[PDB]
Design an enzyme around this catalytic site. Structure first.
Site, short mmCIF file in Angstrom:
data_model
loop_
_atom_site.label_atom_id
_atom_site.label_comp_id
_atom_site.label_asym_id
_atom_site.label_seq_id
_atom_site.Cartn_x
_atom_site.Cartn_y
_atom_site.Cartn_z
N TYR A 121 -3.36 -6.86 12.64
CA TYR A 121 -3.85 -8.12 12.05
C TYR A 121 -3.74 -9.04 13.55
O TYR A 121 -4.44 -9.95 13.97
CB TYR A 121 -4.28 -8.39 10.78
CG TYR A 121 -5.33 -7.72 9.87
CD1 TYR A 121 -5.78 -6.64 10.36
CD2 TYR A 121 -4.97 -8.47 8.66
CE1 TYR A 121 -6.19 -5.90 8.76
CE2 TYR A 121 -6.24 -8.11 7.38
CZ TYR A 121 -6.57 -6.31 7.78
OH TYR A 121 -6.88 -6.09 6.87
N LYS B 254 1.24 -4.53 6.35
CA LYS B 254 0.89 -2.89 6.27
C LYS B 254 1.32 -2.11 7.73
O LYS B 254 1.43 -3.50 8.46
CB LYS B 254 -0.44 -2.14 6.34
CG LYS B 254 -1.37 -3.52 5.73
CD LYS B 254 -2.59 -2.51 5.34
CE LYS B 254 -3.38 -3.11 4.12
NZ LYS B 254 -3.70 -4.36 4.68
#
Lengths: 258, 260
Positions: free
Chosen positions: A48, A73
């Site tokens: 992201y 993540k």
């Protein structure tokens, strides 16, 4: 708000906010609004590119660290045994945190050796205290069988797209069979399910919003449910899903849409 | 130049479009304004979204000739029926500030089959009246499509469904093609996760394109009309730039193998 107990004895809130596809300012605003509203489970990802933003909102929130549940993540470029361990540490530095609560492989990929190695790396990450719990996203039955058989360590969570038009009944069975928690994202079906006739009938029966029904259903499946951002008004509304329950018949109806 | 698809009714739609689902009036007006300035012409809204007036304000404000813009909106589920859908189409036009829409869709079939069959008959009149150039559906399965075609004899132009490489809808695309129905995809990025999928990133690298561009290009090469969720002005301009490259058959095969 209610928790689920993971297979490593750690607990997570059954609802959280996701910050995918948000700019730094949008991510920071969203996390800051969600925390003020009462959200504690935050779902981000290295891919992201907004971990620093999320870390900033957390640090400014004045909420004790041990009441917040931070998920991030492994980015796909960082997959591997050695590289994943460095990647988790790099995420901590961006987040301004000493540990994350949940750390996930983002995708298995078609190269079995890479995700197997990534999982062995994440095992070290948990051992080292870098992550409290470890898990995966979008692992199918064969992917799970592979990591369980080759590493003997079972994920805490399997994060997957899940909504009444994609209910993931098959994979939830596999997950539950391994004592893995299903985490749902995309609970509203790209916004379309908010106008689904079955969803609207059930919402009207309960005097709740369509989004509330969609979320409550997913919670009653045993899922941890992640809502995309959002706006201060809708965020508060989405969190308010513990004052009603859907009936067996209502569950059956929503269960029959897929 | 943005390529078009030709519908079963001989009308044409651009192969890419922007959607305004879950946007406030302010957000929808901003996003539609941005998209139109960047070169998008296909706009996907719905009565259930509550932002039709905002979308129409942006369309009007642009100064772009009406006949270069392709407006899609949708029958809200509370308005379903034969008589009520015809009123609803007109109420949408009034909110949109338009004399016609290019594409008008049933949003959901629903368990009440009589309701969607009647909705379909109403939309046939909407098209006959010139209120919509083309009519179609969202999220109709094979049985839903067989029901409306068998009972009304009129085939949808479009069937709009969620579609990305983790949900490639190969079967439904086959059903659609059998009826000469164009598949329209939404959620092409898989709630954002596919942006980091290793197979997408390898192919993006091979082309010197972004992951989103590869994801949209794949959907286009499947024959779909592809709607992108509303994003920032920078992203939307990038997402539109998907006609200066082509995925190879091997690259298509790789992206086709992800949903198993």
């Amino acid at each position: 708000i209610p928790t689920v107990t993971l297979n490593d004895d750690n607990t997570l809130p059954v609802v959280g906010i996701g910050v995918g596809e948000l700019s730094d300012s949008e991510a920071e605003r969203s996390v800051s609004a969600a925390l003020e509203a009462g959200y504690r489970l935050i779902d981000t990802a290295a891919a992201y590119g907004n971990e620093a933003a999320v870390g900033r909102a957390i640090a400014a929130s004045g909420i004790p660290r041990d009441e917040i549940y931070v998920t991030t993540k492994l980015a796909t470029p960082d997959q591997g045994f050695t590289s994943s361990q460095a990647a988790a540490r790099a995420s901590l530095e961006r987040l301004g945190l000493d540990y994350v609560d949940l750390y996930l492989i983002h995708w298995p990929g078609g190269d079995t050796s890479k995700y197997v190695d990534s999982w062995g790396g994440l095992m070290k990450v948990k051992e080292d205290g870098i992550a409290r719990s470890i898990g995966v996203c979008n692992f199918g039955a064969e992917d799970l069988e592979t990591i369980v058989s080759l590493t003997y360590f079972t994920p805490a969570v399997n994060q997957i797209e899940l909504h009444p038009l994609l209910n993931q009944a098959a994979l939830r069975e596999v997950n539950a069979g391994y004592n893995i928690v299903t985490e749902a994202y995309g609970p509203l079906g790209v916004g379309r399910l908010l106008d689904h006739p079955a969803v609207t009938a059930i919402a009207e029966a309960h005097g709740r919003t369509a989004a509330q029904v969609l979320l409550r259903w997913s919670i009653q499946l045993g899922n941890v449910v992640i809502s995309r951002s959002a706006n201060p008004e809708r965020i508060a509304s989405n969190l308010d899903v513990f004052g009603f329950e859907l009936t067996a018949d209502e569950m059956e109806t929503l269960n029959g849409l897929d």
